[model samples]
Target: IQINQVRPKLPLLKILHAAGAQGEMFTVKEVMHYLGQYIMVKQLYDQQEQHMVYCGGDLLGELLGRQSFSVKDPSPLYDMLRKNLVTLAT
Candidate 1:
């Protein structure tokens, strides 16, 4: 019973830390929503319906950086977020 009781909290705890919550209450919700939107847009793009993800000429702006000038910077905010978060990616 105790194992199951604590498992649900672990993912959110990881999410909170990744978001740099810093003891803030709403950080988890904000990060979760942002990430959720990113996933949705990415899926749409992968399925060949790419237009839905580009808003105001920003390629996947919601997650990939919306600033017009930042697009070619080589390391956008998304890369920074990935660098900060724990990565097991190949």
Candidate 2:
């Protein structure tokens, strides 16, 4: 089977590389998987807000263009991150 793929832009590429994704191209699902894992490992979820996630780290800050931000769901996060990816043919 084939899957749609994307290449991360420079900023996102650095973040993905830091998270151990050593490839230029990935499926959107794969990208989200890596971001989810990275968020979990970084413990970025907000305890009080429960449904919200905290943006931390220089890379995340740069990507989101803020030192701190919150997202109630990963979809918005994925949307933001998607802007930094270039879609490619399967």
Candidate 3:
């Protein structure tokens, strides 16, 4: 695969953010951002929500945000997947 400048993100900062709850939401703002364009992508949380359009941080795996996907639409990363092809891990 062509990861390019893709850099793998931290799983703890990504997955662990989730609690033991179903239907849990971290909000579109509390949401973590990632740089998927570079390498494998990195995960990071943005405390500041100044400019949402170009404020994506080093957060990739956080789209799910310590929460599990139910119907899928409510999922965080759904917007990026539109018209794009990618896969998730177990």
Candidate 4:
């Protein structure tokens, strides 16, 4: 899969700042070590939110309804997917 510069859901520097750490004060290695200690919590939090968007009923329900019958409404990714594919390919 092509990520094509997809943005992160969480900003690590901001997260560290919220935790009272000065990200710039630490060396890159030290920053990485600090982040690793809390990475699991971060990952699970990400999963929880992601599941809400993808596994949540609303987006999936709309997709299912659209696929089964002709509809007037446009697909959410109708234009986005095409551009996204071009972005990825390039």
Candidate 5:
């Protein structure tokens, strides 16, 4: 009768451990959000939406601004948007 009991999630436990191992440099929410984006990219891959996924990844990079070794690289942001605009030509 207890087939649906709440079981300890070993995978989540592992994730917690991995996130914790990163130490005080990162916040819990930041790591969680990164994992969310990664999983979203996987979903987009499964859905065959490579362009959309790339756009989303670029958007995240813009929001974080830690990409390209320069948190202030404006051209990449503009170029990414320009490419996406071209891709979405209607």
Candidate 6:
């Protein structure tokens, strides 16, 4: 299958490795999918705002570089997280 791959940097790489990602290169979609599972597992989403993810002083918090902020929606959230990844040349 044809897919765009990216190499995740430091903290993000660490997180993904722990999350059971196999290798150094991954698709942006895979990265976000893993993170989505993480958010669900951690119960990080806000009750009042279902689309918002609350960084709760954990790995997700560190990944986001914030201890007291919520990110809204997967699209924009991916935008922020993509900063920690280097897109590979196809």
Runs of candidate 1 exceeding 4 Å displacement: 1-25, 38-44, 48-56, 62-90
Order of models, best TM-score first: 2, 6, 4, 1, 5, 3
Give the local distance difference test score of model 3. Answer: 0.29
lDDT of 4 by residue, 1-90 (tens): 434322111344444454455524444444435433433344422354432222123322242332221123335423322322222223
Q: Name the lDDT of candidate 1.
A: 0.39
Q: Candidate 3's residue-wise lDDT over 8-88, tens digit each?
A: 234422332342212223222222232222211222322253112222332333433433222224334454332122223
**lDDT value, candidate 2, whole model:** 0.71
Question: Residue pairs in steric clash, candidate 6?
Answer: none
Mind sharing the TM-score for model 5? Answer: 0.23
lDDT for predicted candidate 4 compared with the true structure: 0.35
lDDT of 5 by residue, 7-89 (tens): 22333323333434332223434445443555354453325533233324443444434333221444653443333221211
Per-prediction TM-score: 0.23, 0.73, 0.18, 0.27, 0.23, 0.72
Return the top candidate by TM-score: 2
Of the two candidates 2 and 4, the one with more favorable TM-score, higher being better, is 2
* TM-score of model 3 (CA atoms): 0.18
lDDT on C-alpha atoms for all candidate structures: 0.39, 0.71, 0.29, 0.35, 0.36, 0.71
* Range of the 10 consecutive residues with the lowest summed lDDT in candidate 5: 81-90
The true-versus-predicted C-alpha distance at residue 84 of model 2, in Å, is: 0.3
Error of 1 at 86 (Å): 17
Summing lDDT over every window of 10 consecutive residues in candidate 6, give the lowest-scoring window: 67-76
Model 1 scores a TM of 0.23
| CA lDDT, candidate 1, residue 7 | 20
Per-residue lDDT of 1-90 in model 1, one digit per residue for the tens? 221111213334454444343332333235556444544544533345433333333333433444322323435545635443432232
Q: How far is candidate 2 from the true structure (C-alpha RMSD, Å)?
A: 3.1
Candidate 5 overall Cα lDDT vs. reference? 0.36
